[PDB]
Amino acid sequence: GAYKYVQELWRKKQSEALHYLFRLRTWEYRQLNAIKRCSHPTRPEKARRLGYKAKRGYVVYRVRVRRGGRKRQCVHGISYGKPRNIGIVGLKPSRSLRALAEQKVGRRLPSLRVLNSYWVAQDGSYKWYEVILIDPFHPWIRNDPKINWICNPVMKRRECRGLTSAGRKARGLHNKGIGAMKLRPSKRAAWKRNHTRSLRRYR
Template sequence: MGCCHYYLLFTKVFSADVYELITMTVCYSIYYLFSFISQLKVRQRATMGAYTYVSELWRKKQSDVMRFMQRVRCWEYRQLPSIVRVTHPTRPDKARRMGYKAKQGYVIYRVRVRRGGRKRPVPKGIVYGKPTNQGVTQLKFQRSKRSVAEERAGRKLGGLKVLNSYWLNEDSTYKYFEVILVDPAHSAIRNDPRINWICNPVHKHRELRGLTSAGKKYRGLRGKGHLNHKARPSRRATWKRNNTLSLRRYR
């Protein structure tokens, strides 16, 4: 009986240890399985799309690849007219962020703008008026080169409407921009509820009235919130209004 008692006691202890071991093994297996799944989810989130890789390339403009590509492209751009149509955007990621779609009705034009300041357009350098306004050189244009590129594209292509633009390249003499234009008479544009707002006549020559993204930037209208409520119609107009002495005349 003593041997049987010891045998039963050993069997109970052994079975309890085995049960505990199996339980711990299952728990650890479940834990490692869930941790592996969570790592997979993190890896899936970390993977980037094609346009993200393209934008990362354009962020590293001083890399050997981008420097070589930009120099070769700049040489090609110099041989072509100042305003030329391109079949597809050179920066597809940037073009899509600016509103471009690869569908009928959207066109891309590359515009070349000369760098540097702006001389006052007066014949023979003669400026009439007070000495404070006699300057001809060393004058800075209030608008950006990008807005000038949009203006030139809009004037040349009067039947299209300027949607947006972005920087493309530059050398010592010129800056190059790609301008996105939309055909308001195309059925694909008129039937698209996301873009057919531009077919309204009030959006004629948006680029000439500072209504594009570049136009709002040089007008100082990029800010939001209560600190920018009185910034209309532009930052310079607000400064002039606040710093001009206006007195009533006795008549």
């Protein structure tokens, strides 16, 4: 039961021990490329929690995402329109950096499927997240009852369709009951059903 201790050590991040490890790790991740393959999960305990198993066809890729708010892509800093829509630099991104990271490593590797992402490091301009990607066509993954669900074609590009945990957090599905009543099948699908005019044959 070693992992109970490593979860406790990762609860104490500000500790001098882990601050040193976190500084060396970050100085190194800075010297590498944005999307890098990591041979092993740099966090074996967190990977295991999100479904990583050290079998062939399970891969870990670290993706570096830039830290800060969104700036709208309007030329010359001008968004012509009603005054409410005139604002370009104070906007906050709609999806978290954890979700942006998954979407970026999904485009880089369209053949693989994305399980989940964990935070590895952060700095004043960049946050690093590590993603677990599964090869749907590997024999070990196909012939495994536990992970053969990813091999199904509906799970193709899950991070493009907001079905990963980070994407589902952005859609508000991490919440149920009051407040989540108008965002269940989807925010758009609730709007369509609520605003549908049902002209029954006997009306």
